[PDB]
Design an enzyme around this catalytic site. Structure first.
Site, mmCIF file in Angstrom:
data_model
loop_
_atom_site.group_PDB
_atom_site.id
_atom_site.type_symbol
_atom_site.label_atom_id
_atom_site.label_comp_id
_atom_site.label_asym_id
_atom_site.label_seq_id
_atom_site.Cartn_x
_atom_site.Cartn_y
_atom_site.Cartn_z
ATOM 1 N N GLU D 70 1.068 -1.523 0.242
ATOM 2 C CA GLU D 70 -0.238 -0.189 0.213
ATOM 3 C C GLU D 70 0.435 0.994 -0.003
ATOM 4 O O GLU D 70 0.384 1.784 -0.301
ATOM 5 C CB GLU D 70 -1.311 0.434 0.440
ATOM 6 C CG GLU D 70 -1.983 -1.152 1.186
ATOM 7 C CD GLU D 70 -2.426 -1.997 0.854
ATOM 8 O OE1 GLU D 70 -0.762 -3.037 2.145
ATOM 9 O OE2 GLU D 70 -2.386 -3.274 1.236
ATOM 10 N N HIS D 140 -11.397 -5.133 8.458
ATOM 11 C CA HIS D 140 -12.743 -4.599 7.143
ATOM 12 C C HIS D 140 -13.886 -4.110 7.692
ATOM 13 O O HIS D 140 -14.876 -4.432 7.090
ATOM 14 C CB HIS D 140 -12.884 -6.180 7.037
ATOM 15 C CG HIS D 140 -12.272 -7.027 5.723
ATOM 16 N ND1 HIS D 140 -12.617 -8.453 5.640
ATOM 17 C CD2 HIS D 140 -10.706 -6.755 5.577
ATOM 18 C CE1 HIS D 140 -11.351 -8.659 5.209
ATOM 19 N NE2 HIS D 140 -10.437 -8.239 4.949
#
Ligand SMILES: [Cl-]
Ligand SMILES: [Cl-]
Ligand SMILES: [Cl-]
Ligand SMILES: [Cl-]
Ligand SMILES: [K+]
Ligand SMILES: [K+]
Ligand SMILES: [K+]
Ligand SMILES: [K+]
Ligand code: NA
Ligand code: NA
Ligand code: NA
Ligand code: NA
Lengths: 336, 352, 352, 336
Positions: D70, D140
């Site tokens: 990322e 999540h």
């Protein structure tokens, strides 16, 4: 300079803020054989001299340099702490803590919760220089506490003096939760005072009322405490206003009760910090105090903060929430 | 080094395609007797039964997921050999860090079916108190550090634990499992470099099953970090075992890291052929074991489904060791809310 | 690759100590005529004058820093050759990313002394508007991307720029300079890997001047990423030039990355010996040039000190392209404050 | 489910939220030949189907996978944007944006300022799934907007529906500042409505009053808008209270004027978000509204937020600031 530094536990000796950190660190390694200190450049004393002589005293296996990689330093620290050993990591400037943000927020802060307390990294403390320094510009000036305050599971602690630093740092090192200790670098050599040689603790999550007052409550932390202390004196002399001055000390979990108790008495609140206004920790204090103290608040809560810009080089004198900016906002609030 | 007086770029060709260490061919035969570990019958059977019990569990929990009875699942298919094989080479107290494909390590370490199931169901028996997503297993007793979703974050943590073990003068290793994908993360670079420069007794165990790297896999990175490296056949439990065993012995003695890259895509089939060749298994044993395994898993499964979830108060504990007064205020706010509005919440499915 | 039937760990010994490419010995003599670039007299003199003008500037600004006239400074001592040498091998419009030791690239590209000085003083002539710390140079006209303090953040950015250049069908390269320290950061691993897997026309230029790595420097990492790599003598401008020139030609043609590791600790001395051997310089030229350089630098220095700083309003612009109404409110708050409290601020030293 | 989704630009067609993102992306690549889309897994359509068919339509050089990193994705994106090409990066879950925190906060946000506008990365947009999803647990589920709100130089935008998403995403892509677009993943398939096929824009930094009311002002964003819309209906039916319902939409720079104008009219404010209370964006809204609206506020401002914990798996129904929690707080505020 924009501030002036001013002001029971056995023998003391004069220490500036960097020396008080060394003394905390030394006491810690003496007491706790597991404890180690590591970072980019700590072996030979560090950029701000905070680890001078520790490697010679305790050994190269306990005071050592890592590769230049902040994400690694914190992950590595977590790992040490998982085994129950005390890990004291240094991030060279607070501005450089961001590569480690995932390891702090997704890992360190959640380690205990997510495991049902089967594993923890409570024995981790990350210490880092913090705050403005006159010419640090965008990446040697930053005050990142508000980013961390939105992360349940970590503590964030900021001292205002050598005495406060050593006691608060020892409490972080010994606290059973991962702690970030932000050292206001402009005070490393500037602020000097008597500090106990032997270990002592100052409690976390406890604000300190350093001056009682009755018309208004002033809250800050780090260097800015010294600014609001002066602003209080300005207000007394120029306005006849009595200011209650509070050093927050622990940013999270913060001492809601001390701040609210003061505001019930005074009925007015001004919070100041070097960090940008928007999203800054003053918002959380203001919003909370308003919820708990609505019937007592005689005026809107003031936030005197950095502007919503990056921290500039040449323009620093115009950027910082100095005593005049605080004083003027206090004046307007009193006249409300 | 020396000087060179002509300009020459070093190609990625340097040493080779790194070859894949194999011990047992696809028919379960030992290829080179000098490499036979000669593991005892009882431990080889334990390898086999662990792999197949994991596979039985996987079948049942995968279907449970497809039905919405648990929210999420990750199987172990094709990785059963790498995990049991490496786990068998470790000491019981060697600390393990991993990601999603490491349940076989737990299974080899006799983690109860009830507790795999409790975590997946978030029920009252879960020592993780129902707080993470399914398959985010952890066990303090079995030195298996709780799995977290963010990829590769365990890598530099594993190194720190290994540095701490070195200091404690332990005769302990740390193993850190991760995939080839996770090896792309910055935290992987941190771990590898820190392990080498800080001289840590750690085994990096990379599962490799075009867009991820351009050199010769992950093993080809090891030398550049100063890390001893090998590539093994991940379908061959004995190749894995041997490589892990030697890595562990050297890592612990020398305080240096080792990298094993296990190539994967059957391990179970290959091991079964081996057992037959020794006279250690047959079709009747296979049939009885499949039946017993299925019964063990189904009993755990049914029990796990019927358990209540934990007390909702457990939402608030372990955020910090202690519970901050302001967090207790939130917990009290919840309790006041459920007193008035509880009929709108599934209170009957949760403890107390 | 193939299988191997005995267990063997790959040692970090794989290929070698990577040797250091050299063209010119410490007496300025060409070692191997096949490697002479035969650069024309005017460009070699330009290499020499750029290096020595940088060194003169460094002396004066370092002393300015010691006196507190500027807040911070970083010299270029020992890196003058790597920077001029590589810069000379690039096309004018090749985009450069760097850190703190890359001022020679600017100097080779004829960046004015006035503007180096303006940035260091934060004065009204600074196109950076006085906002960053000294030596955080940048120039759009000369395709030198503004330096930022955080280490290695420019590495994956440089790769993105290179990917964009590939698409634009450019005949442009990107070069990205960094130190061996910065190569420890995760962002370095990202850059290297992305450049290889995404096939980007980029030159990674690593300055290498025990605690940082354990393999054979940074060049030994290249092959493991699938990156063509070389190690050069950073005190040898011609070795640097040659390696950069060939890297650029191949990177642009093949859309592949190259890694050059320049070993550094004099480049200026060695180049001066070369000039004498050709009859291209002598002591009278050296004396006149030292005098002229010093005068040029001192004129810029004195001018830069006497300029006002920028309007404090520039504190608020360029945060976003436009200025949000709430940020304009803060700017208005400052102006109201200076009307009342201005005597407490250095208004006379700032424009308007 | 804890919410119910409910409710001039040419031809429209029924789209859910993931389809509306694809349509924005498609329109963008059609209009702007420089534009590229990249991330861990975008080539074959992505985990949430947001990039389906784009690679086949526009080419593998424009819709491509990066390595799993990322920090790299965002750095790489910045780099593309520095050249003036449109870079649309995906971070697979907002929870995984933290490794990129240094590239976003120290790099992207400051790129233009620190260079005197010699260089910029205005043509960068980072899109990421966001918010609770019933069973996402700690990694999540997260709502990271408050972390980003304390960073001058970036915009943070969150839509509530397919129509809102496509218009707001197009505005982010075309805006000349680096933007984070958070897509509420629980709506990807749930929320469906008519969406123009051709490009259109919804302005940034503009809240939307979706329901006028006179007794109280309710502010949220993303999915939580649908929760407060229901709470308004509950308040009308059960209490006779008229609620003004506002979707903030842009977190920074936020529409202070719309929120303050509403509160001057109603005299009361309740803000709700899924993110934890402490340091959450509700603090900044509350503290600001209090400063601008002090003479009109009849009661303390309510914040109904997530608790100060990590986001739990099994306990999600008890964690989220659902309609009953909002309703009860609204009731108490009305009775103040
Ligand atoms: Cl089944
Ligand atoms: Cl049962
Ligand atoms: Cl001088
Ligand atoms: Cl002049
Ligand atoms: K601690
Ligand atoms: K992990
Ligand atoms: K940089
Ligand atoms: K944009
Ligand atoms: Na993995
Ligand atoms: Na994989
Ligand atoms: Na560097
Ligand atoms: Na260096």
């Amino acid at each position: 300079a924009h501030f002036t530094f001013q002001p029971e536990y056995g023998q003391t000796q004069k220490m500036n803020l960097f020396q008080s950190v060394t003394s905390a660190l030394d006491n810690s390694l003496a007491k706790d054989p597991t404890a180690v200190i590591f970072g980019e450049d700590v072996a030979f004393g560090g950029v701000f001299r905070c680890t001078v002589g520790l490697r010679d005293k305790y050994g190269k296996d306990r005071v050592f340099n890592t590769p230049l990689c902040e994400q690694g330093i914190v992950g590595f620290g977590i790992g040490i702490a998982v085994t129950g050993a005390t890990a004291i990591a240094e991030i060279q400037f607070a501005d450089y803590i961001f590569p480690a943000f995932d390891q702090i927020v997704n890992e360190a802060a959640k380690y205990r919760y997510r495991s049902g307390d089967l594993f923890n990294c409570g024995s981790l403390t990350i210490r880092s220089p913090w705050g403005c320094v006159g010419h640090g510009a965008l990446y040697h000036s930053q005050s990142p506490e508000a980013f961390f305050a939105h992360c349940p599971g970590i503590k964030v602690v900021i001292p205002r003096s050598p005495f406060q630093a050593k006691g608060l740092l020892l409490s972080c090192i010994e606290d059973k939760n991962p702690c970030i200790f932000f050292e206001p670098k402009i005070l490393y050599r500037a602020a000097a005072e008597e500090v106990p040689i032997e270990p002592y603790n100052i409690p976390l999550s406890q604000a300190e009322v350093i001056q009682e007052g009755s018309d208004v409550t002033l809250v800050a932390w780090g260097t800015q405490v010294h600014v609001i202390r002066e602003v209080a004196s300005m207000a007394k002399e120029k306005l006849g206003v009595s200011c209650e001055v509070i050093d927050l000390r622990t940013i999270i979990p913060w001492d809601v009760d001390t701040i609210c108790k003061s505001v019930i008495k005074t009925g007015r609140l001004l919070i100041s910090h070097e960090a940008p206004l928007t999203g800054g920790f003053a918002s959380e204090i203001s919003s909370t105090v308003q919820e708990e103290c609505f019937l007592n608040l005689e005026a809107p809560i003031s936030r005197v903060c950095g502007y919503d810009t990056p921290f500039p080089h040449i323009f620093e004198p115009f950027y910082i929430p100095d005593k005049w900016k605080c004083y003027d906002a206090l004046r307007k609030m009193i006249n409300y | 080094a020396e000087f060179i007086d002509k300009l020459e770029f070093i190609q990625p060709n340097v040493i080779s395609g790194i070859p894949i260490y194999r011990v047992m061919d696809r028919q379960g035969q030992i290829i080179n007797p000098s490499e036979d570990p000669h593991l005892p019958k009882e431990k080889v059977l334990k390898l086999y039964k662990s792999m197949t019990l994991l596979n039985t569990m996987d079948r049942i929990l995968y279907e449970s997921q497809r039905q919405g009875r648990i929210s999420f699942y990750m199987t172990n298919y094709g990785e059963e050999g790498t995990h049991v094989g490496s786990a068998a080479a470790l000491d019981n107290t060697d600390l393990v860090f991993g990601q999603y494909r490491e349940a076989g390590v737990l299974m080899y370490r006799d983690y109860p079916l009830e507790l795999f199931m409790a975590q997946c169901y978030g029920n009252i028996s879960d020592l993780g108190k129902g707080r993470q997503m399914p398959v985010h297993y952890g066990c303090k007793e079995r030195h298996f550090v709780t799995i977290s979703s963010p990829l590769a974050t365990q890598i530099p943590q594993a190194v720190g634990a290994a540095y701490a073990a070195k200091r404690a003068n332990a005769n302990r290793v740390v193993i850190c499992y991760f995939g080839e994908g996770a090896a792309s993360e910055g935290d992987a670079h941190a771990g590898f470099n820190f392990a080498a420069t800080l001289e840590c007794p750690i085994i990096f165990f990379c599962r490799n099953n075009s867009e991820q790297y351009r050199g010769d896999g992950i093993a080809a990175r090891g030398p550049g970090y100063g890390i001893m490296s090998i590539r093994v056949d991940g379908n061959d439990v004995f190749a894995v075992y041997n490589a892990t065993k030697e890595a562990r012995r050297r890592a612990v003695a020398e305080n240096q890291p080792f990298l094993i890259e296990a190539m994967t895509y059957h391990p179970i089939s290959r091991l079964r052929h081996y057992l037959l060749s020794q006279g250690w298994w047959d079709e009747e044993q296979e049939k009885a074991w499949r039946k017993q395994s299925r019964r063990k898993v189904m009993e755990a499964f049914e029990q796990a489904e019927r358990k209540p979830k934990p007390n909702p108060n457990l939402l608030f504990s372990d955020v910090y060791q202690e519970m901050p007064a302001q967090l207790r205020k939130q917990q009290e706010s919840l309790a006041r809310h459920l007193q008035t509005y509880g009929e709108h919440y599934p209170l009957d499915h949760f403890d107390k």
